[PDB]
Paper text:
We then prepared cryo-EM samples of [name] in complex with the same off-target DNA substrate to visualize how [name] recognizes this scrambled substrate. It was clear during classification and refinement that this dataset contained conformationally heterogeneous structures, which we separated through 3D classification. Within this ensemble, we could resolve four distinct structures, corresponding to 1, 6, 8, and 10 bp of R-loop formation, where the 6, 8, and 10 bp structures contain mismatches. Serendipitously, the scrambled DNA sequence contained a four nucleotide stretch of complementarity to the [name], located in the [name] outside of the typical protospacer region (GCGT). The mismatch-containing 6, 8, and 10 bp structures align with this region of the DNA sequence where the first four bases of the R-loop are complementary to the [name] with subsequent mismatches. As observed for Cas923, we observe REC2 and REC3 movement in the 6, 8, and 10 bp structures as the R-loop propagates past that structural checkpoint. This phenomenon supports a model where the REC2 and REC3 domains must be displaced during R-loop formation to accommodate the propagating [name]:TS duplex. Our mismatch-bound structures portray an ensemble of possible conformational states that [name] can adopt during target search. Without PAM specificity, [name] locates partial target sequences from which it cannot readily dissociate, nor achieve nuclease activation.
Author numbering: 3 to 282, 288 to 571, 590 to 712, 718 to 766, 918 to 1015, 1042 to 1047, 1061 to 1366
RNA sequence: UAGAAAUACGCGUUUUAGAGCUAGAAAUAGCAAGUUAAAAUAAGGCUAGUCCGUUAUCAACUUGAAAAAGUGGCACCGAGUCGGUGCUU
DNA sequence: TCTCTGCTCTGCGTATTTCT
DNA sequence: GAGCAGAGA
């Protein structure tokens, strides 16, 4: 009557089993609903549930951020058009309308087809004058003529739209650091400051480090050659410590700045008051040469002086492209005239036409064309340009990502400065346009929502619409940054209503420095028994040792106190340098407010906003130091548990006990685990949907699906056996490779989940009556149990192994707890306060109680019988598919009606569009369709695919949507929603899973008997066993006596494939390759048949390789066959079905 | 060592614009040119925000707007995917 | 005109921050 | 899985 549930949770499967107390699996007749004639079906209580893996939110978040990026870029262009509109409406009123209409075909445009000037002659004159946009940008930067307003708009919009990166914090400017000649300013500044004053010996300047990856080994000898080595560090030539940041905060070379500790390049190069700016410019030349090195990595050489180096570089790139194109065309005309057509006309060969007009990248084009250049001659400069990857480049490439926004800002500022005198409105709001260019939303403000986003946290000061200009006076930056941090910090596990402290909080140090010291003992000559440190002794070691050394260290613990962390305290005592104000605890709440602020915020002026209320306590220079100190890391527990929770025994919260208990020292965990002290019931009093009850819990997104499916499997399995509760549930835990780590995460909470949902009734004497022992096992035990008693799994044949593993889980679990009852508290979850050889006398018992726990003999027979069962409930979970509407690439225009439009008014016979849509779920319809030249209603019944785009419009009103598809007189009740992997049964018990509206999938399972899978495991692993010798030699002799098993395996494959797979050509190719290869050795034959079971695999058809050939898979490319089949509606365990005979409809 | 969120960048794809010329009933053939720009980048939605739109959830049936709740007898002998036999309403 | 066989097609590279 | 074209009716 009693039973036990075995489970096996994976990333794609949940195997379940139900055993009775003699390890037999029961079977029952289950009721069949539906209009079929079969009314009751016998089923075994063992099976598995397979599903697609759950996906992370990663791709969704990336596409959401991309959506917001494109929205904000379009808003930038709209702001710029708003600024320009009033004046631009006097020279070309339809201009912005033409730019909007530019995508449309010649007929769909309302205005003339030439966007910029609106006629052919001015447009072609413009394109001959400025071949690229960069010619126009350089012309507007350099020339001083009054330009046409439209060209100004194109230039400004081209910088505002494609504005480059923001990774450089400073004021990067290519108006002083164009060329690498900074030696004169650097050396003259050095010799103006210093006395002995060496002089230049090599002018290589930045081009030394330009040629290599950064290292001391590059720059040391080069700076010695540049400048003779009077000062091996601090020569103040171009050197790595001044050019490039140092990650450790090592002291400076010389006491010009008190040996200031070095940092990376940041805003801290503007403020260095503590050691440099208040005590001592060389560093102006240093940052100038940093500008020099980085621009020389990104900007080519400029011999002409100009305010637009990037546009000049792009013009140079264009001109060299033109010259090498002309030279290459002449060379190919002269020496290889037959290749000219292939190179310059054929746009599918990765030639020049395929690189410009086709889809070949620069790398592919170079790889194609380089043998052509090498076999020719006169190509030397082209070959070396190709070797430097600077042959026939394009102005817009993958390498433009290194360009910082300061260069575009300089060019835009130069254009506005030149052209402001002719257009007054350009001068009136130059700051507005620059603000449009340079504004970013801060990463701590997040989306600028109005309470309709589930991601936003922004708090706005005023009901105004946010814009780049009014941003500062509309968003409360302080509150928004605080909310940006506070939403991520987690509550403590003991009281989920108070925010935890920073790790550098002083109260957390009065936890920390005495918590470890509480359970340390001092054992010496002074007494005969070990004693904990007294509170007075703890205070003494703190005051002497820990108040001079941050880190606990047992060597100095010995040789400091007994022969005679506080890092925040030490730093704050080397800043304020007053021990009184730190030892003062009366004022400590304001000090924790300071600690909280320096933990929350990193942008410095926000630090000033939080510190304004404390200016009266301290002088200004130490607030400037406070800007430079930053705290990271958060504490593990809350302020109420720190101090607030007064006890009823001593007036001593935990940290008061850690400070001073004298003897009988009690640690944090013992104090909170104690109930006789009034902390445990406080934790108890401190404490309606399973979905939320797992949502905020930790876990990989894949495994959480498996856990929820496991819980629903347990619920339905309990429901199946008439609400009688189990007494054991066995769970996978491979704790001490993604599978290993994901299965180790599982048992942090699944045992809690099952124990909470299972055990729910209690009494007054005990607050839970333990009725289900939640067993938990490691896969190692089931592994040697499999490999030690000839029950081998092979994963390639069938999905029964999941259920088989579940069965093994249950049997070894129950047989272990019955064998060692006293070891419940090691494995049973719910009650704990902190081997395998007995399976190998024939009858084993607990002994302390005479119950039989294992019977070598009938038990192994029962297990063999269960593994040899043919019927195992495999159920593929039907899911409505969700995700992207279609594949992402935009196919060119075609005269096909399968192209999906990109927009409402973009007919995809003129504009192209997407292909390969994804069906959410198919829908069986039965209606009349007007087929035939003579329009007359033939009744039809066919499947239809409802794609993800059409899903909402279908569920809004199915009848109108189907009538729009052409169907007439749709039988509304007869509409059947069929998700993916909907299961159908056909003749001879041949099942098919519906992969889509127009494709099927294989559905049956080859239930190969246990002797053959044992043989195949013993064969395919032929000389890789590494066990006891005589055992593997008798296994060798066993596989040697049984070669005929191979031939009967092939008959099984032929029979199953002739019954269910219906792939004739695949079958006799397999048979012919077998018959022509029957003489090969056993290992290769058995391994190739193990690949050969892919023919009979559940799921999609897939190609597979034999000894000498790959056999193409037979795809089932139509669903006409299932419209007269038995559709099966399987429950989650698959025991409850609902068969619909579709042939009786319409 | 990974999950989850935010702010940005560079490409890519698509259609249009960048007058192709000559010899020709041409099917065409010779020759020149090629680097750039606009717009879109899930269709779209309404609370109209510089917001949201690809994560999670989901067998069937009966109630319920929804949330949700409920609905399927047992033992034994066998096993080609479950079959048979015997009690019970 | 409506179903089968055989072969081809498929968005990408980076950053800065967070919290766990 | 879908797409596409090229044959069997």
């Amino acid at each position: 009557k009693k039973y036990s549930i075995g489970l096996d949770i994976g990333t794609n499967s949940v195997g379940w089993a139900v055993i009775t107390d003699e390890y037999k699996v029961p079977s029952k007749k289950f009721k069949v609903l539906g209009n079929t004639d079969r009314h009751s079906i016998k089923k075994n209580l063992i099976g598995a549930l397979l599903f697609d893996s759950g996906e992370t939110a990663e791709r969704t978040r990336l596409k959401r951020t991309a959506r917001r990026r494109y929205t904000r870029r379009k808003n930038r262009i709209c702001y710029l058009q708003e600024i320009f509109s009033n004046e631009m409406a006097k020279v070309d009123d339809s201009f912005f309308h033409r730019l909007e209409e530019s995508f449309l075909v010649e007929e769909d445009k309302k205005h003339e087809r030439h966007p910029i000037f609106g006629n052919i002659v001015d447009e072609v004159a413009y394109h001959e004058k400025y071949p690229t946009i960069y010619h126009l940008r350089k012309k507007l930067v350099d020339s001083t003529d009054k330009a046409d307003l439209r060209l100004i708009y194109l230039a400004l919009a081209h910088m505002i739209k494609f504005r480059g990166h923001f990774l450089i914090e400073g004021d990067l400017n290519p108006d002083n650091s164009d060329v690498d000649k900074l030696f004169i300013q650097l050396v003259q500044t050095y010799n103006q400051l210093f006395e002995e004053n060496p002089i230049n010996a090599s002018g290589v300047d930045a081009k030394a480090i330009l040629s290599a990856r950064l290292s001391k080994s590059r720059r040391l000898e080069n700076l010695i050659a540049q400048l003779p080595g009077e000062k091996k560090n601090g020569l103040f030539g171009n050197l790595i410590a001044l050019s490039l940041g140092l990650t450790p905060n090592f002291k400076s070379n010389f006491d010009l700045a008190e040996d200031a500790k070095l940092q990376l390049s940041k805003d801290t190069y503007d403020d260095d008051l503590d050691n440099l700016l208040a005590q001592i410019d060389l560093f102006l030349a240093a940052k100038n040469l940093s500008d020099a090195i980085l621009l020389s990595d990104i900007l080519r050489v400029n011999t002409e002086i100009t305010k637009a180096p990037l546009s000049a570089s792009m013009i140079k790139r264009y001109d060299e492209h033109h010259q090498d194109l002309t030279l290459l065309k002449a060379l190919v005309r002269q020496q290889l005239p037959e290749k000219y057509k292939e190179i310059f006309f054929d746009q599918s060969k990765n030639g020049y036409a395929g690189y410009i007009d086709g889809g070949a990248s620069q790398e592919e084009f170079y790889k194609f064309i380089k043998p052509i250049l090498e076999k020719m001659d006169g190509t030397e400069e082209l070959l070396v340009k190709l070797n430097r990857e600077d042959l026939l480049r394009k102005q817009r490439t993958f390498d433009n990502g290194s360009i910082p926004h300061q260069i575009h800002l300089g060019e835009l500022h130069a254009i506005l400065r030149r052209q402001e005198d002719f257009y007054p409105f350009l001068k009136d709001n130059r700051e507005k346009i620059e603000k449009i260019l340079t504004f970013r939303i801060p990463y701590y403000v997040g989306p600028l929502a109005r309470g309709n986003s589930r991601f936003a946290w922004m708090t706005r000061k005023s009901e105004e619409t946010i814009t780049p200009w009014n941003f500062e006076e509309v968003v409360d930056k302080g509150a928004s940054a605080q909310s940006f941090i506070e939403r991520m910090t987690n509550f403590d596990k003991n009281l989920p209503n108070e925010k935890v402290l920073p790790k550098h909080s002083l109260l957390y140090e009065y936890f920390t420095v005495y918590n470890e010291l509480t359970k340390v003992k001092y054992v010496t000559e002074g007494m005969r028994k070990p004693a904990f440190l007294s509170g007075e002794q703890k205070k003494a070691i703190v005051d002497l040792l820990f108040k001079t050394n941050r880190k606990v260290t047992v060597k100095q613990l010995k040789e400091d106190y007994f022969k005679k962390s506080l890092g925040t305290y030490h730093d704050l005592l080397k800043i304020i340098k007053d021990k009184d104000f730190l030892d003062n605890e009366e004022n400590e709440d304001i000090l924790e407010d300071i600690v909280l602020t320096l933990t929350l915020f990193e942008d410095r002026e926000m630090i000033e906003e939080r510190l304004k209320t404390y200016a009266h306590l301290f002088d200004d220079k130490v607030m400037k130091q406070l800007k430079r100190r930053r705290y990271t890391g958060w504490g593990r527990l809350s302020r109420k548990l720190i101090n607030g929770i007064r006890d009823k025994q001593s007036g001593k919260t935990i940290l008061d006990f850690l400070k001073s208990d004298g003897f009988a020292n009690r640690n944090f965990m013992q104090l909170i685990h104690d109930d006789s002290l009034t902390f445990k019931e406080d934790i108890q009093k401190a404490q309606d949907s399973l979905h939320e009850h797992i949502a905020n819990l930790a876990g990989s997104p894949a495994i959480k699906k498996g856990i929820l499916q496991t819980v629903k499997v347990v619920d339905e399995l309990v429901k199946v056996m008439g609400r009688h509760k189990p007494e054991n549930i066995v769970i996978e835990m491979a704790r001490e490779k993604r599978q290993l780590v994901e299965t180790r995460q599982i048992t942090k909470h699944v045992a809690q989940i099952l124990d909470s949902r299972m055990n729910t009734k209690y009494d007054e004497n005990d607050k839970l009556i333990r009725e289900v022992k939640v067993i938990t096992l490691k896969s190692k035990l089931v592994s040697d149990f499999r490999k030690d008693f000839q029950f081998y799994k092979v994963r390639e044949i069938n999905n029964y192994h999941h259920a088989h593993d579940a069965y093994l889980n249950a049997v070894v679990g129950t047989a272990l707890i019955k064998k060692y009852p006293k070891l419940e508290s090691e494995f049973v979850y719910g009650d704990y306060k902190v081997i395998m050889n007995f399976f190998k006398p024939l009858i084993e018992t607990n002994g302390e109680t005479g119950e039989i726990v294992w019977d070598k003999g009938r038990d192994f027979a029962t297990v063999r019988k269960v593994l040899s069962m043919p019927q195992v409930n495999i159920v593929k979970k039907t899911e409505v598919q969700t995700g992207g509407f279609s594949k992402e690439s935009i196919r060119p225009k075609r005269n096909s009606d399968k192209l999906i439009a990109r927009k409402k008014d973009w007919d995809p016979k003129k504009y192209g569009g997407f292909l390969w849509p994804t069906v959410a779920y198919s829908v069986l319809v039965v209606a009349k369709v007007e087929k035939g030249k003579s329009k007359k209603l033939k009744s039809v019944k066919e499947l239809l695919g409802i794609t993800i785009m059409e899903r909402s419009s279908f569920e809004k009103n199915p009848i109108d949507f189907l009538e729009a598809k052409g169907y007439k007189e749709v039988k509304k009740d007869l509409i059947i929603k069929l998700p993916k992997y909907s299961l159908f049964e056909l003749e001879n018990g041949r099942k098919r899973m519906l992969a889509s509206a127009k494709q099927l999938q294989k559905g049956n399972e080859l239930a190969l008997p246990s002797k053959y899978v044992n043989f195949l495991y013993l064969a395919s692993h032929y000389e890789k066993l590494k066990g006891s010798p005589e055992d593997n030699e008798q296994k060798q002799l066993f596989v040697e006596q049984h070669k005929h098993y191979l031939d009967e395996i092939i008959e099984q494959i032929s029979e199953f494939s002739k019954r269910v797979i219906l792939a004739d050509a695949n079958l006799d190719k397999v048979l012919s390759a077998y018959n022509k290869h029957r003489d090969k050795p056993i290992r290769e034959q058995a391994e190739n048949i193990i690949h050969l079971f892919t023919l009979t695999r559940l799921g999609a058809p897939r190609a597979f390789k034999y000894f000498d050939t790959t056999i193409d898979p037979k795809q089932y490319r139509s669903t006409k066959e299932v419209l007269d089949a038995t559709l099966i509606h399987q429950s989650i365990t698959g025991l409850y079905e609902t068969r619909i005979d579709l042939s009786q409809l319409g």
